[PDB]
Amino acid sequence: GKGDRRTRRGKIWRGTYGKYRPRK
Amino acid sequence: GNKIHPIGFRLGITRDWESRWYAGKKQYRHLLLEDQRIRGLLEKELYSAGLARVDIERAADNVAVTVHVAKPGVVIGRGGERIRVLREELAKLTGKNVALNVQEVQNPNLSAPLVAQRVAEQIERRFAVRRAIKQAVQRVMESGAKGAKVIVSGRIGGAEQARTEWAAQGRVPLHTLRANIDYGFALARTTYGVLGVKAYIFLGEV
Amino acid sequence: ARKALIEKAKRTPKFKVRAYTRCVRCGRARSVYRFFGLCRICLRELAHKGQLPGVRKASW
Amino acid sequence: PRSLKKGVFVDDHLLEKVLELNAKGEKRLIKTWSRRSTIVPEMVGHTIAVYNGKQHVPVYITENMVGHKLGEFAPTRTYR
RNA sequence: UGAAACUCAAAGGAAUUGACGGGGGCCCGCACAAGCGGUGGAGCAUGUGGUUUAAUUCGAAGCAACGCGAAGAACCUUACCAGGCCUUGACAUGCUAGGGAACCCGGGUGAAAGCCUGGGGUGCCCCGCGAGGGGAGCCCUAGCACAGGUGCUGCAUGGCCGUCGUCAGCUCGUGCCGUGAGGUGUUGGGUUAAGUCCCGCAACGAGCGCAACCCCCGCCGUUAGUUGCCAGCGGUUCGGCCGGGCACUCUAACGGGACUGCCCGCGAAAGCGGGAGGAAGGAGGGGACGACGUCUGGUCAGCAUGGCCCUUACGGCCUGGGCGACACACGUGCUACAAUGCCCACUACAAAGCGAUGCCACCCGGCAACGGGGAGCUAAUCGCAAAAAGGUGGGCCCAGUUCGGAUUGGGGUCUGCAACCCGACCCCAUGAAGCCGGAAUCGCUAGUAAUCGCGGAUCAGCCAUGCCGCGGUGAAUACG
Ligand SMILES: [K+]
Ligand SMILES: [K+]
Ligand SMILES: [K+]
Ligand SMILES: [K+]
Ligand SMILES: [Mg+2]
Ligand SMILES: [Mg+2]
Ligand SMILES: [Mg+2]
Ligand SMILES: [Mg+2]
Ligand SMILES: [Mg+2]
Ligand SMILES: [Mg+2]
Ligand SMILES: [Mg+2]
Ligand SMILES: [Mg+2]
Ligand SMILES: [Mg+2]
Ligand SMILES: [Mg+2]
Ligand SMILES: [Mg+2]
Ligand SMILES: [Mg+2]
Ligand SMILES: [Mg+2]
Ligand SMILES: [Mg+2]
Ligand SMILES: [Mg+2]
Ligand SMILES: [Mg+2]
Ligand SMILES: [Mg+2]
Ligand SMILES: [Mg+2]
Ligand SMILES: [Mg+2]
Ligand SMILES: [Mg+2]
Ligand SMILES: [Mg+2]
Ligand SMILES: [Mg+2]
Ligand SMILES: [Mg+2]
Ligand SMILES: [Mg+2]
Ligand SMILES: [Mg+2]
Ligand SMILES: [Mg+2]
Ligand SMILES: [Mg+2]
Ligand SMILES: [Mg+2]
Ligand SMILES: [Mg+2]
Ligand SMILES: [Mg+2]
Ligand SMILES: [Mg+2]
Ligand SMILES: [Mg+2]
Ligand SMILES: [Mg+2]
Ligand SMILES: [Mg+2]
Ligand SMILES: [Mg+2]
Ligand SMILES: [Mg+2]
Ligand SMILES: [Mg+2]
Ligand SMILES: [Mg+2]
Ligand SMILES: [Mg+2]
Ligand SMILES: [Mg+2]
Ligand SMILES: [Mg+2]
Ligand SMILES: [Mg+2]
Ligand SMILES: [Mg+2]
Ligand SMILES: [Mg+2]
Ligand SMILES: [Mg+2]
Ligand SMILES: [Mg+2]
Ligand SMILES: [Zn+2]
């Protein structure tokens, strides 16, 4: 969930981007 | 502790600001720090003139300004020898080169800031508080005004137990956002400590 | 405000980091609003006096 | 998950005091206030006394510890 | 029948204003009940107690202290601690003196601070042919007048705040009653959210409060179009793109609008119950606003302030620690325990905000953090920008498991002089507890609760899961 750093919703919550949530 | 400053509360209507100068997120803090430096000196000296207000307008290095006093002369000087030194004291403070008008306070007993200053002085000279208050309310109430009130803090009369003297007449509706009430606060150092003096004058409604 | 730690005006921090806002009016160092250079306390004091132009009491 | 980037940091107090001290060879003791500085190769063999805020702890530097900061060998607090 | 020694400053009566009652009668409030979701359980974040420490700076202490002062502790901040160095001082206003201009740049030494120590240099005023002499400013000493002190008193205080509270209520003037405190007014019937209004009354009025006057949201209209439209038409790179137009939507100034006015019913009236128009009724919904006063409440560490105390140190400068300690206990929260769910795709629909030593389109490199490079924006023009929940599709099949992401190993990117103590962020490993929480206990009456994400202040960065705001979806229940 929101606490999973390396996941979709995880990056959102932590307000970041990366492999699991790229900037499109 | 309750009740907001009746001026900060009435800025919307019945009560304009004391600095009508616009600015942007880069200079505002400066033009502000400046006004204070101004009021800092103006009050540090013109005390004797009895300065009720001090507006400050701007447009660009042409800092309007003004100073509403009860006794203009004290400002001016022999022909204008004081209003000279000071006028240069402003541009020496801030190389802005600005005006320095002077409005006269028609009645110094309808300007809360003075009425406060008034009583505040008496307190230091050791006048009986209750009297001063009773009187002050009168001066204000006699020379017009639909209402008025005065408040002194504590250690009244050098007492160890801080109290709070009252006194007030007519109307003074603070909850009514339209009263147009002048508020004036005057400190009051003393051998034993500070005493705060607030003054409220209700003049005209709508 | 310990009029000695009001050496913030120093401008010679050796390293720009050590630079810290600090109130211009109270010396209050813990709630200094960039925009006013004042602390939250004085920012509230002057605003009441109408000495901060434009600054009104918001409500909605 | 350590990090610093490209440009390993080391205060030049002891540096020009060590690489320079390597001219004659080695020496007994040193005294630094730079927990900040990284331990580099040219220190192995030295005995750098590090300050922990109250003391100057004698830290013998070895190969296996090249890379760690000096502070890591001068523990700050005192528990039981 | 009825003393005394000794001892007290009272013991008592009636009445008054209060407070109180496990006295009575009316009546309110998420007070209970009715509900819906939570917290004391787990892991973690944060504040606190307690321990510990050279120091773990200080305050806050039932409600109303405990994500509180702190809307940003690596150094700074920080007031704490350890060391090295200053000591008319970091900052004010003056002084006689011993005496040398101000200023610019150096090198030893050192952790820095500081200390030695050596040099380019030497204008200005009246004198003097000059030599050189006496002074303003200035700086440097040496000795004064003093500065400084987040050192103690918030029970010596301003100011400001919290609290009982938006709870109604607290009073006055004159008159009347009572020897008097003090009553009457303000009690009483009806009514209201309200000491709101009505009726009645030895009382008639008034002040601070209630309400109203201010702000936001809801409907309509003027005035205004580098935002909107193809509604209308004609050009199309089929992009409101271009022409062109203010209609619409907005943007934002000013107005209109609701008054129990209208209708039926009850009533002495105020007003209550419905009904019609109307976007909106009978305080439309939400704010700002919190009386006389109480807590002898908070705060001298925001400031101001009396007294007290230290004035080569209770002042000052640094470097490094500390505020981040950890057997343990509590508060507030975060993320969860899963299928009304978790993934990966792919697709939608926001509102308020912020943006020069900045938002950062777009392009290239990198799994990525981020780095190169650069378009446009002083922003209704550009940017942060994706909103998320949803919707379509597909995977997982019920397992400590595609639930959950705590720990820990490794490799990196950034901000910064600098991330050991003690920063976020990325990637690979690791994959803890937890299967819905004892006794207790918290919030909320509707766009509220629950749930979803977005922006701001502070700020280099950040330990924001805090805080202040914004909009999407949108319940249950209230006998009493
Ligand atoms: K009795
Ligand atoms: K309203
Ligand atoms: K008190
Ligand atoms: K959830
Ligand atoms: Mg998962
Ligand atoms: Mg101070
Ligand atoms: Mg800082
Ligand atoms: Mg600031
Ligand atoms: Mg006797
Ligand atoms: Mg009696
Ligand atoms: Mg009684
Ligand atoms: Mg009773
Ligand atoms: Mg209610
Ligand atoms: Mg309610
Ligand atoms: Mg209940
Ligand atoms: Mg728990
Ligand atoms: Mg312990
Ligand atoms: Mg204290
Ligand atoms: Mg503490
Ligand atoms: Mg809170
Ligand atoms: Mg520190
Ligand atoms: Mg107090
Ligand atoms: Mg106080
Ligand atoms: Mg206290
Ligand atoms: Mg009310
Ligand atoms: Mg009477
Ligand atoms: Mg009588
Ligand atoms: Mg009575
Ligand atoms: Mg009376
Ligand atoms: Mg009464
Ligand atoms: Mg009475
Ligand atoms: Mg009565
Ligand atoms: Mg009533
Ligand atoms: Mg009334
Ligand atoms: Mg009556
Ligand atoms: Mg319209
Ligand atoms: Mg009101
Ligand atoms: Mg208390
Ligand atoms: Mg107290
Ligand atoms: Mg702390
Ligand atoms: Mg908890
Ligand atoms: Mg790539
Ligand atoms: Mg298990
Ligand atoms: Mg798993
Ligand atoms: Mg660190
Ligand atoms: Mg299971
Ligand atoms: Mg925010
Ligand atoms: Mg930030
Ligand atoms: Mg941390
Ligand atoms: Mg955060
Ligand atoms: Zn201040």
List its traits.
part of a larger assembly; 4 chains; C: 60 residues; mainly alpha; 30s Ribosomal Protein S14, Chain N; 1 helix; D: 80 residues; mainly beta; 30s Ribosomal Protein S19, Chain A; 3-stranded mixed sheet; 9% helix; globular; binds potassium ion; binds magnesium ion; binds zinc ion; RNA-binding; ribonucleoprotein (chain A)
Given this structure, which CATH class of chain C is correct? Few Secondary Structures
Terminal Cα span of chain C: 36 Å
Helix content of chain C: 10-25%
Radius of gyration of chain A: 7 Å
CATH architecture identity of chain C: Irregular
Percentage of helical residues of chain A? 25-40%
Q: What fraction of the residues of chain C are assigned to beta strands by DSSP? A: under 5%
Can you tell me the CATH superfamily of chain C? Ribosomal Protein S14/S29
- Are any ligands bound, and if so which? potassium ion, magnesium ion, zinc ion
Characterize the largest beta sheet of chain A: strand count, sense, and whether it forms a barrel. Answer: none
Order of helices and strands of chain A: H
How many helix segments of chain A? Answer: 1
> What is the domain total for the residues of chain C?
1
Instruction: For the record, give the distance between the C-alpha atoms at the N and C termini of chain A, rounded to a whole number.
Output: 21 Å
Order of helices and strands of chain C: H
Structural class of chain A: mainly alpha
